[PDB]
Chain A
């Protein structure tokens, strides 16, 4: 239910 956040924050 959470909009995915930019992948740059997951790296």
Chain B
């Protein structure tokens, strides 16, 4: 349904497989029953984390996620965004999996894979609001899994119905900006290692209320409200990255969203917008079923 590695998806070698809980996952589950301003990711905390890397010049392009031993999920706008003259071909990119350090070439840890083909949702709307901001990248050859490389699960209807609720927290990860960056400054820019932040899903009415940009059912927003005190948000560079939730039903990590867009980063009254993975999952299914798992 997604490719080799789906059966054991969402279970991390360094955590679930060892009956070890990461430092902030209980915060997520508590929200179900009860990157700016984030923190350094733990080793193997997000084994599905993928870094979209430009072949030449060598630079970080976006975040992404591993959904199988041969398929990588990301935001459509990460590969195609005409307004900024962006339109990559499978030949210009590489995917770096199992990474922690943003800049270091982590030999014997990370895996750099070439792309066989990229697919962008046919109805992706880059013109207005990045509607249907989803894309898939098939690796030239399957990658072997490791303590640092493991696919995330794609949500089924029941899991999505249960967890996609206002207040329910998800986890966003990426090597994106540590803060809104507009001009040269000696302050914090990009992180040294993968950043992680847990954020609550926001009620659709508030999401639409927070922006002049037209919101569609193919997206959802997350982040704390000003009155909630806590902060946190994805930022430029986190695009394409995963917004995951740990299922209380089978303790597997599911990707409910993809870092899509926002206005500024961690601004009061603003919320990060993510691609609604479940609602667009059937496209992923159609593509993978057509072009082999």
Contacts and interface: CB of A to CB of B under 8 A. Distances in A.
Interface residues of B, number: 15
**Range class of the A interface residue count:** under 10
A9 B112 contact: yes
A3 B169 CA distance: 34
Contacts of A2: 58-60, 102-103
B118 to A, nearest CB: 17
Interface in B91-117: 94, 96, 102-105, 112, 114
Interface string B55-68: 11011100000000
Contacts, number: 26
Contact of B56 (A1, A6, A10): A10
A10 B96 CA distance: 13
A5 B104 CA distance: 9
B56 A5 contact: no
Contacts of B103: 1-3
Contacts of A10: 55-56, 58
Contacts of B190: 1
Contacts of A3: 103-105
Contacts of B53: 5
B73 to A, nearest CB: 21
Nearest to A8: B112
Nearest to B53: A5
Closest 6 CB pairs of A and B: A3-B105, A9-B112, A2-B103, A5-B105, A3-B104, A1-B103
Given A2-B60, A5-B94, A5-B96, 19 more contacts: A1-B103, A2-B59, A2-B102, A2-B103, A3-B103, A3-B105, A4-B58, A4-B105, A5-B53, A5-B105, A5-B112, A6-B105, A6-B112, A9-B94, A9-B112, A9-B114, A10-B55, A10-B56, A10-B58
17 contacts: A1-B103, A1-B190, A2-B59, A2-B102, A3-B104, A4-B58, A5-B53, A5-B58, A5-B96, A6-B105, A6-B112, A9-B94, A9-B112, A9-B114, A10-B55, A10-B56, A10-B58
